[PDB]
Design a protein around this ligand. Structure first.
Ligand SMILES: NC(=O)C1=CN([C@@H]2O[C@H](COP(=O)(O)OP(=O)(O)OC[C@H]3O[C@@H](n4cnc5c(N)ncnc54)[C@H](OP(=O)(O)O)[C@@H]3O)[C@@H](O)[C@H]2O)C=CC1
Ligand SMILES: NC(=O)C1=CN([C@@H]2O[C@H](COP(=O)(O)OP(=O)(O)OC[C@H]3O[C@@H](n4cnc5c(N)ncnc54)[C@H](OP(=O)(O)O)[C@@H]3O)[C@@H](O)[C@H]2O)C=CC1
Ligand SMILES: N[C@@H](CCC(=O)N[C@@H](CS)C(=O)NCC(=O)O)C(=O)O
Ligand SMILES: N[C@@H](CCC(=O)N[C@@H](CS)C(=O)NCC(=O)O)C(=O)O
Lengths: 276, 275
């Protein structure tokens, strides 16, 4: 199927991810792959969409399991010879008043939101075809968390020259510092979720740079984004946006017209660049 | 007299960690272990601390000019300069890695040559009288050199080559691989090898500049091969342990005060080799 354009969404069985799959089914000229970690919930979501007259393909994917990521990589390489659109939407959050010890929240949330997302990029970024787009769903909480970090930490996270390996070290340091009970003293903010989304936002900046230096001329665009405050199982019902509204900026970034030079490596909210 | 300081890049594992261990034992003063990952770096320091050694730590990623410059500023403030610099940090793709060759060339060159070059640009001005600088190259540089066209060999063996000419040739290799013309343009097959030609020739150039600019300060700078060493880079079939691998770099870093040489040499098993 190498001649067919293909778009893929992670965490696509519910919430924002499902809304993105719906929009891409309608707007993307090619195949759309809904992925989910639970094959039973994934296939049920597909069946549900079929009842709305939409036909995304399905493939299992748990971003915490490197063998799951590699199986998907091999599938795409085999069927499509690559990938045109990748939406990294999968993510988790503990409740604001969750009693789980903070260092556990830090470790678990970082494991999925940062390391899982990073592993998907490691394995799938090489497969992105020319004119392809990559969208990492972050959060405006990443900016709030950034501004709540020590000046030392802010300088590192805003750097234009930070490397993936430096970022990995800083993300692991946050998790270790919470375990040692010293995260406040070491300059970190109080939202584990927020810090993991700093990782996502900064990883996007790093990867956009890497694309510009390794794939000049291939016209690939990669950005981080915030979907806004969306009524899903994550945020609950007090939120102001429907999932369909939440999907608007991610879809915009996925479908940027061919030959666009930007936005690239930007943090985007309501289709506009936010200063990092 | 006063405080002396020695610093190793890529010190958290492999040959670098072994060099740090040796320097902690043999170098009187502070020995700074640096690593790009602060978590791995501090774990490495803890490991040495369990052994009775007391290395200092500072973050350093040689791909990040701001990281290099932060280290430069730290060294100036804390020590007023640097006595020993070991440029050990390096990467290699596997022999059978499926990554496109032109990407292997770009990524390997970015670290091994350009990163090493940036550390030298920023830290060489800080080297104190009787200081020593050791650039960890590889015998793969000689093997790569001998695999270049006669015309390229002439350029790389030149006693008059400039840093800027060498930069242009390293960038030319990376460009030629992307264009799919590197073999025709006279380049060898090992990207890693070509990056270490860069390291070896940069060392010759910098020794020459030290002699021009800072004669009388008795600084010695050399390239070396640690040999074939069992690390995450080479694997378990290699013939040397990391401690054995550290022997030549440590010998070059600790050359006695006032020694006239070696300087600007490529050294292996503590012996000067022909370039
Ligand atoms: N206000 C909001 O809702 C905001 C949300 N976000 C971000 O939007 C994205 C989507 O969140 P939202 O739709 O709200 O949340 P939901 O909880 O409703 O959906 C999250 C999706 O991610 C999946 N997921 C979680 N972990 C994994 C993993 N290990 N592997 C594969 N899939 C996984 C879930 O699968 P499963 O059903 O199996 O649990 C689910 O499909 C997240 O990244 C979130 O951080 C950002 C800003 C605001
Ligand atoms: N092993 C061998 O047979 C030989 C090795 N060499 C050279 O010896 C040196 C050490 O290699 P070896 O110990 O085998 O390799 P290892 O992979 O075991 O260790 C390499 C070290 O370099 C660090 N490093 C890599 N890139 C960077 C960077 N961007 N910034 C800071 N540190 C970095 C690594 O950090 P991290 O842990 O974060 O990756 C690690 O500490 C290299 O220059 C290599 O080319 C030369 C001849 C033979
Ligand atoms: N205790 C958690 C709180 C995380 C959190 O912010 N939770 C949810 C409420 S459960 C959220 O919806 N955040 C979404 C966003 O706006 O990005 C932590 O420190 O990580
Ligand atoms: N595909 C690579 C291969 C690099 C390579 O030679 N391998 C490393 C990995 S096995 C090594 O261990 N030897 C290093 C040395 O002897 O200096 C390239 O062309 O650069």
């Amino acid at each position: 199927s190498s001649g067919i354009h293909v778009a893929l969404v992670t965490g696509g069985n519910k919430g924002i991810g499902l809304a993105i799959v719906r929009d891409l089914c309608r707007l993307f000229s090619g195949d759309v792959v809904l992925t989910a970690r639970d094959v039973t919930r994934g296939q049920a979501a597909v069946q549900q969409l079929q009842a709305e007259g939409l036909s995304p393909r399905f493939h299992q994917l748990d971003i915490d399991d490197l063998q799951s990521i590699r199986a998907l990589r091999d599938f795409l390489r085999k069927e499509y010879g690559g990938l045109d659109v990748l939406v990294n939407n999968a993510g988790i959050a503990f409740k604001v008043a969750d009693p789980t010890p903070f260092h556990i929240q830090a470790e678990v949330t970082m494991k999925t939101n940062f390391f899982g997302t990073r592993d998907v990029c490691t394995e799938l970024l090489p497969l992105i075809k020319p004119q392809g787009r990559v969208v990492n769903v972050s959060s405006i909480m990443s900016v709030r968390a950034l501004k709540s970090c020590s000046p030392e930490l802010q300088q590192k996270f805003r750097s234009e020259t930070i490397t993936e390996e430096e970022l990995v070290g800083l993300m692991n340091k946050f998790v270790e510092d919470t375990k040692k009970g010293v995260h406040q003293k070491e300059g970190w903010p109080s939202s584990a979720y927020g810090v993991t989304k700093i990782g996502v936002t900064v990883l996007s900046r790093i990867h956009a740079r890497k694309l510009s230096e390794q794939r000049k001329g291939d016209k690939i665009l990669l950005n981080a984004c915030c979907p806004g405050w969306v009524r899903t199982d994550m945020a609950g019902p007090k939120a102001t946006k429907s999932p369909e509204e939440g999907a608007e900026t991610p879809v915009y970034l996925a479908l940027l017209p061919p030959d666009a030079e930007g936005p690239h490596g930007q943090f985007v909210s309501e289709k506009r660049v936010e200063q990092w």
